[PDB]
């Protein structure tokens, strides 16, 4: 599924990401935009053999288990396939555990490069929430 900007903002609000651990909602919508272009089925194979899954491109080496990644740790205790659903529940649950580490949202490279330091609130403006 490819979410519309406002559609995802509303969904993420229902999923409790607005002001989760100090991060305003715009951060999450902006992150999804540059990490997967709002596509829940997005996948990206990496060099180390790991793969980034879903709307928030969660990595198979540290966060989810896809059974094909070397030093996998499955920190989110969830199969990577669960992060490829049109239902964002699992991706949000895992994203919350990720951001709860001291590194915060810096875990998301696209967010760090295209969102951090920008007017992230702009990503939820002009939306019925």
């Amino acid at each position, epitope marked *: 599924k490819v979410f519309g900007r406002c559609e995802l903002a509303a969904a993420m609000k229902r999923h409790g990401l607005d002001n989760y651990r100090g991060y305003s909602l715009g951060n999450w919508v902006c992150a999804a935009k540059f990490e997967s272009n709002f596509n829940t089925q997005a996948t990206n194979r990496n060099t180390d053999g790991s793969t980034d899954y879903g709307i928030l491109q969660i990595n198979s080496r*540290w966060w989810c288990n896809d059974g094909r990644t070397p030093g996998s740790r499955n920190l989110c*205790n969830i199969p990577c396939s669960a992060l490829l659903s049109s239902d964002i529940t699992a991706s949000v*649950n895992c994203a919350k*555990k990720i951001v709860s580490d*001291g590194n915060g949202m810096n875990a998301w490279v696209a967010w760090r490069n295209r969102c951090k330091g920008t007017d992230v609130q702009a990503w939820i403006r002009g939306c019925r929430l």
Partner: antibody
Amino acid sequence: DVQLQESGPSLVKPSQTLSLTCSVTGDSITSDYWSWIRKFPGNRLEYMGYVSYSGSTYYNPSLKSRISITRDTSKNQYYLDLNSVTTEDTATYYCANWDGDYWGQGTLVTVSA
Amino acid sequence: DIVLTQSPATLSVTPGNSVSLSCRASQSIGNNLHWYQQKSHESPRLLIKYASQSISGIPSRFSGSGSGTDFTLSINSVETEDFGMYFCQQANSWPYTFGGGTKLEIK
């Protein structure tokens, strides 16, 4: 599967450092975030803090920075140190993973002269 | 910190009847409210995560609902095994905090 178990002295003196150990069996401590929670008499629960995969820690401000949570991979254990305890630190201490799925049995520690 | 207030403090019920426990937050926390059960001499047990998400291994009679500041834990037809303490916990902001708890007893 995973199992957690607390260990350490049950009786401590005021002003000393209270230390507890949580032994994890079934998986590596490097694969989760680990926490400490305590229950005071009167059914009052307090989340003490947790250590995440990067080694970063989050401590409850209520503890006035008297707490330290560390890990030992080689022994697959993590620890709790609480400095300068007072009778107000008497409670049942539990270790559990961040998700809340795995908990130790809990251990009562009494602070008394 | 975010303060969680639970009510009633105690609730007596006859097995077979249903009950609902309340937990209200001092500020909006979205769906970031979790429910725990605790019996004397035992460690807490997670019943519901993120306000309404089910947990594998927990009886289906337990369900959670709510968002923002008002949440409830419902038990459809209480069983004797359900008597004990119930606590809500929020993980929206650090430090995580717990509600004062509700004691469910047999009537």
